[PDB]
Amino acid sequence: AVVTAAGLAWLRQYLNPMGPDTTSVTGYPDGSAVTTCIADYSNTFNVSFPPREALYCTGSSSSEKPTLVDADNYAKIDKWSNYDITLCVLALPMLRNVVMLRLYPHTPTAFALTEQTPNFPQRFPNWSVYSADGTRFNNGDEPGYLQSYVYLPNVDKHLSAARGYRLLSRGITGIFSAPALETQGFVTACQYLAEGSIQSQSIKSDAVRSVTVNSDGTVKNVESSSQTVSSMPRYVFPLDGDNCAPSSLTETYHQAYQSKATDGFYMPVLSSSRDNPFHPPQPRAIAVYGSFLARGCLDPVSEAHEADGPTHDIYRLNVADDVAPLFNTGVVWFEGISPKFSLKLKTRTVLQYIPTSGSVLANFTRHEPTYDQIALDAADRLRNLMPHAYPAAYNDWGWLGDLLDSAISMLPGVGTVYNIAKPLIKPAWNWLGNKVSDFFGNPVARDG
Amino acid sequence: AVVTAAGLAWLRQYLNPMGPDTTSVTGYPDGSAVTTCIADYSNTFNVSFPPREALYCTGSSSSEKPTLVDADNYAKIDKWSNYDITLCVLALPMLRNVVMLRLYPHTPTAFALTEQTPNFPQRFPNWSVYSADGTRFNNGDEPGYLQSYVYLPNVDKHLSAARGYRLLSRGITGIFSAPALETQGFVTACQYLAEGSIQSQSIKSDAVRSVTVNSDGTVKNVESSSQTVSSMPRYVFPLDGDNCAPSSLTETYHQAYQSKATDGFYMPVLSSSRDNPFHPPQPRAIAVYGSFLARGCLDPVSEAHEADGPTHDIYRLNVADDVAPLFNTGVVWFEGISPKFSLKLKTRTVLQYIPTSGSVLANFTRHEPTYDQIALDAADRLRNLMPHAYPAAYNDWGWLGDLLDSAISMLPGVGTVYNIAKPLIKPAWNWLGNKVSDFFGNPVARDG
Amino acid sequence: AVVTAAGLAWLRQYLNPMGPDTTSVTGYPDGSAVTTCIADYSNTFNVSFPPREALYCTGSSSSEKPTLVDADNYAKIDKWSNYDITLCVLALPMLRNVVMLRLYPHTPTAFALTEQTPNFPQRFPNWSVYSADGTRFNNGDEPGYLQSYVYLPNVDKHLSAARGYRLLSRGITGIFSAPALETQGFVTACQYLAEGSIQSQSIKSDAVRSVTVNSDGTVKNVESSSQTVSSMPRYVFPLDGDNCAPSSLTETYHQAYQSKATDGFYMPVLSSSRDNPFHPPQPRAIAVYGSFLARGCLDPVSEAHEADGPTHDIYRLNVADDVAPLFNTGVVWFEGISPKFSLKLKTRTVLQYIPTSGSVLANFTRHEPTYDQIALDAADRLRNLMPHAYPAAYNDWGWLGDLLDSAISMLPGVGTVYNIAKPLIKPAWNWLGNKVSDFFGNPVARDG
Amino acid sequence: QYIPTSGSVLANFTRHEPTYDQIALDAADRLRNLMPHAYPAAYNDWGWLGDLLDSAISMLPGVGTVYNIAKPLIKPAWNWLGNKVSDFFGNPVARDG
Amino acid sequence: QYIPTSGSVLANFTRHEPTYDQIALDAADRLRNLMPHAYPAAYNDWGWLGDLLDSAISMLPGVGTVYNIAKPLIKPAWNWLGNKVSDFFGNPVARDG
Out of the domains of life, which is the source (chains D, E) (predicted)? Predict the structure, then answer.
């Protein structure tokens, strides 16, 4: 009838993954009664404007040939460096490939994605170029943007050796810096659930046409294999790419975070569900789910037009991974950034494993199947009222824990002993105008 | 620890969508903290025996040609009009295409469905004819029944412009009338969860057979492409068509509603789940899930017979839509109806949207992310004890709200302050014999 | 605010399916308000070392020919009978085919499964032989192990005649015996959730190659159909076959049961979820989910290598069934068993039906849609702290019910009236060393 | 009721409480001669049945009686043709259909 | 505000509470002649508005008044050029931009 210590610790690391006090690492409070090993991956990447040597092309040029650097089309990308730029990060719930970095000459109207599968998507220090017309880039085209994946290798190496896993928490911090007199820019952050699923797109086969004209050979096998079948199963994410523009996100979600660029960001991605069960590792090809062109049988049609129905485009990412289901997809945008910026990305991913016998993880297990129902209910309660992100320097929340968690742990049901803990009001997170008030009306003087 | 006003209003519109007091429209009480726009679609259709001009044929006759009216086989359908008829409505959870109307010469043994995909299914004012042998109808066959879809166009137009949606409530009313001295007939209504899912049926490819007999041409590519693959993914509904006969529904479900025909009906379709999350629009081809013929590997067989296993027939509807998951499928039957009847269908569908930026919905948003846990728990509690339908004129329930909702809002957990609200007894909804008693023993004198 | 009698009875049969006091049969406490019929299937099988007449081969030898007995390779299996053996039973949640028996000459390193689909898997009295190299067995190979399915025919016959079903409880008892002076051996038991799903494996089509060399015939249709498509949908179980070795199971799960062989076993398989909804019968081909060989797009690759990505092997069982979702998969191992053993398997499967009108089940319905929330919460609570199995003779648990269920029914939320029921401690189930203590510290003197 | 044959289908549906109640049998034998042979098709859920008729008549058999007096029992008048129907306790029957 | 035409797009967005409030209309008619015609672009969220100005002026109309006295109302001085701005209750306006 009261939150335990372990449940409270889990709640604190789940809501504040990169808070300074989160030193101990604790598991999900459900009493799984299974030997588990919890791993904490902290990584840091200094991302800036890439030089030409780390810049490959995804077109059919690098199709069978390995990665092809840019044949000194880098002049156009220098032209980008003349003006201000835009930098998106997209944190899908994939376990490895923690985030997708993307660099634009200027803010796009939507999070476009190429129809054709790219060639050799590049891990972070390298980038891959895409054309301005939303197609893959071969040398001699017009570069549209740069893209890269931030890859955690230890996560792969450990996920190989595990019966099951579950993501405990994940946080991404964006310490931003730029030369003095060029600190201009804005930052926007938003989380939302993009519930992926294993789907296969609808494709067509090819009808064989043989015309034997020989004196005895007159078979004429004109049989039509050109029917509609299902492609490979892929894990498909329904992120509304057309609606991931910054302004749309700000006006849609009330917990979205906005600030000047120098504040950076700190996104503690949150689970969208209430239970977090173990899953066997299942690396699959990831794809992102587009829109449909032909209305098809959305209108009265014939049998022949049942096939070309509302089939949504599926954009292959050419990246395989296993995803943490029920976790929010995060996205931040930096607009009007000076091209000679410097973003220090810090990712902290803590996740639980069930070690496979004889594997490396077996030597690190740590056994307390603690149970705490109240912590889970409190997390489900708090999901809908935490801000989506905070300034990069905003850690060690005074309101968290002894105040917010305690005040909200008395609401669930009537599992309450303390009569009243503390009144809870609606916080006002106006970082742009320095009028920030936390959940209890206390103001927030600037700590950076 | 007490139901709010907004939660109560949502509960009232969810349980009584077409009640007279439901003037205000309110959203799902989960505090989604998202800019939302709630739309209320009220539609009315006067359905009667169709004339010949509004009656098309679905056979291969109208395959590439557009819809083909009946070549004055309408004499047989007049013969139908000689005797009494039967009228089914099937309310699947599809957002548009609110209901499926179907007209039978006499009550069928099951809700049959054609194996071959029909041609040009018709929106309500028009109908489409199907043969008596459970096949599509070409001119010169024996007509078996008529079918049509009741289509809401504004729902489509708005669903185009939305990031996400969720169905809040849906009600269907069936005001029935007929000439005096021909009021004879019966009405039956039942709801049940038919949990659809995205499935692909198993089909076969075609093996190519080339016999080059030329002096140098002797390739003989006899390779067999005749393997088993997966067809298009479709949203498949597991409605037991073989068991949707009226009598079976009455004897299976205790909340099923039965009455004389003149009472009409009023079905407030209910959600089968406890949470109602947003979903991106996903129009897919709808299909209904049949039964299997060949037992296949249900018995010890060889590899070659693994393929022809228990593959269930999938009946394509040739209709594309996106469905409200977790909502019950409703069905009503009118038996022994005078053929010159008149049914006024009134559908009220209220559903929430997340507007896309710049779309029309953006001008109508209305922002109060109210939270009310007790309302959700009360709805989950009440799901299993509300009647499936009421007489068409039975609105403004005295027992609802101040009595039923209040009495049942004290059960959940022990989140209770008022000591005792009101004893709750088992109601007796015997509309046929005029012995109706509500949830508190009060009787129901006839209001129509 | 207190557990009902019906809820308590359901809890007792769910946790102790084969306890002597479980005479009455009761349904799931959710108040489904549906006409239901509960069936109780109790079966007994005396399994021992099979003789040659009941021993078929699964290789391509018995491909189109029906089952083929062993062409007196039975000498090698007698050689097995010279030494000690190993006997696994694998209780997947399939409704019919209650368990899979498997016999090994000596303990394997993993629960291997053949890549090629076997021929004519045999029901229990017969067995099917598999080669030592993990392939199907034709006469003249090296036999690796024997396998059979324990099939319940009445379950099939009743599942044909039902709108919907749900598994209420299932227990498997393993009364073990052997000639005196040969009682040596060990027994291990473990349950774990293997959440299956309808998946289709990725396969390839075949590219047609026609070279018309005729004077007028020069078509040369070289079109490539050799693309990647999806195979048949199958219900796929993610059981970690590589990690089902006995020692790994013992060291992974803390509730795993270990004892000397003569103790037998008694596994009350438990649901892994909290709600148990009805489902329509859906017999599908069952398959077990393997591992992947080629890393594919787990590394930066080209489009052509997106196809050969991490595709996991799917082992077809050549058995069709419909499964009880959310129920644990059980597995027991008997090591070092004298080859002339005798295992009396007793399975009790109790499950609910919604009868189809006019079917046989309709004559046996029994209507009390009892509701009991507390029983469901108590079951969810108890899931994680019950032992996975008990000695075959350990029934009629004193601690169960009046003590364990009562003590734990006061924890959920604060729905508690009795101040304190009884302190609950951590039980110590050390059956090997005769130091067994139940949940309240009381010891367990040996009852057999 | 059935006694299932071993291995038959009925064996899977058995339901075991050999309840004994002598008073119910005596009450049924008593009531046999004074129940109407039929009722209108819509006449179910008899108010007089059970808590009133069965209780009132369960005290007659022998002297196996604890409650002093339950309720006086009169001769009902089932005149369905003329809408003058009175049940076993004089209460009238307004038409329910 | 709109009255939607049947079947039109607006019909899907209707929102029904025909609220009546006479006092609000009278207060608006009263306030029309004494509000400034415009304010500096950054001058929003008026402290004097509503709880002070509307409340103080809602007691004037007729004698439909319950609260004895709300707050004295003086003549504001909107001198934005010289930074000598005083609102309707004499409180000054320090520059917010």
Answer: Viruses
Number of H-type helices and E-type strands within chain D: 2, 0
For helices B5-15 and B373-383, what crossing angle results, to 10°? 20
Tell me which DSSP letter residue A52 carries. G
**Calculated CA dihedral for residues A373, A378, A379, A384, nearest 10 degrees:** 150
d(CA C444, CA C243): 32
Name the nearest CA neighbour of C277 among C333, C343, C354: C354
What is the Cα–Cα distance from C188 to C256, expressed in whole angstroms?
7
Which method was it determined by?
A: cryo-EM
Question: Would you call A254 an interface residue with chain B, using a CB distance cutoff of 8 Å?
Answer: yes
Nearest of A194, A196, A195, A205 to residue A231 by alpha carbon = A205
Question: Cβ distance C38 to C143 under 8 Å?
Answer: no
C89 residue type, one letter: V
List the one residue out of B4, B353, B376 whose CA is nearest residue B156: B353
Spatial CA neighbour of C238 closest among B248, A281, E41: A281
Q: Between chains, do A210 and B210 touch, taking CB under 8 Å as contact?
A: yes
Q: Which tokens hold the place of B402?
A: 């101040």
Pairing status of strand B228-237 against strand B197-204? antiparallel
**What is the dihedral sign for C-alpha B364, B368, B373, B379?**
negative
Measured from the Cβ of residue A65, the count of other Cβ atoms closer than 10 Å reads 11
Residue B118: DSSP 8-state: P
- Kindly state the helix (H) or strand (E) to which residue C155 belongs, with its residue range: helix C153-160
**Placement of tokens 């792969």 in the chain:** A156
Residue matched to tokens 């299997």? B292
Residue in chain E lying closest to B23 (CA): E16
Tokens 């709200």 sit at which residue?
B401
Rg (CA), chain C: 25
Other beta carbons within 10 angstroms of residue A154's beta carbon come to 12
β C284-292/C228-237 pair status: parallel
C-alpha closest to that of B431 among B316, B266, B310 = B266
Residues in C closer than 8 angstroms to D12, CB to CB, are 39-41, 154, 158
Among the listed residues E64, E54, E63, the one whose alpha carbon sits nearest the alpha carbon of residue E31: E54
CA distances from C206 to B206, B225, B360, C222 (A): 11, 6, 49, 12
Min Cα separation B252/chain D (Å): 18
The one-letter code for the residue type at C92 is L
Rounded CA gap, B280 and B215, in Å? 61
Burial letters B145-175, b for 16+ CB under 10 A, else e: bbbbbbbbebbbebbebbbbbbbbbbbbbbb
Q: How far apart are CA B10 and CA A343, in angstroms?
A: 46
Of B138, B92, B139, whose CA–CA distance to B111 is shortest?
Answer: B92
Q: Do C and A touch, counting CB pairs below 8 Å (3 needed)? A: yes
Calpha distance C53→C86 (Å, rounded): 21
Alpha carbon distance A7, A148 (integer Å): 37
- Tokens 């990584």 correspond to A43
CB B15 within 8 A of CB B400: yes
How many other CB atoms are found less than 10 A from the CB of residue B333? 28
**Resolution to 1 decimal, in Å?**
3.3
**Strand duo B228-237 + B257-260: pairing:** unpaired
Contact E9 B366 (CB under 8 A): no
> What is the 3-class SS of A356-410, one letter each residue?
CCCCHHHHHCCCCCCECHHHHHHHHHHHCCCCCCECCCCCCCCCCCCCHHHHHCC
In angstroms and rounded to an integer, the radius of gyration of the C-alpha atoms of chain A is 25
Gyration radius from chain B CA atoms: 25
Q: Does B245 touch chain C (CB under 8 A)?
A: yes
Strands C228-237, C197-204: pairing is antiparallel
Note whether B149 and B100 are within 8 A (CB). Answer: yes
Summary count for chain C: helices (H), strands (E): 6, 17
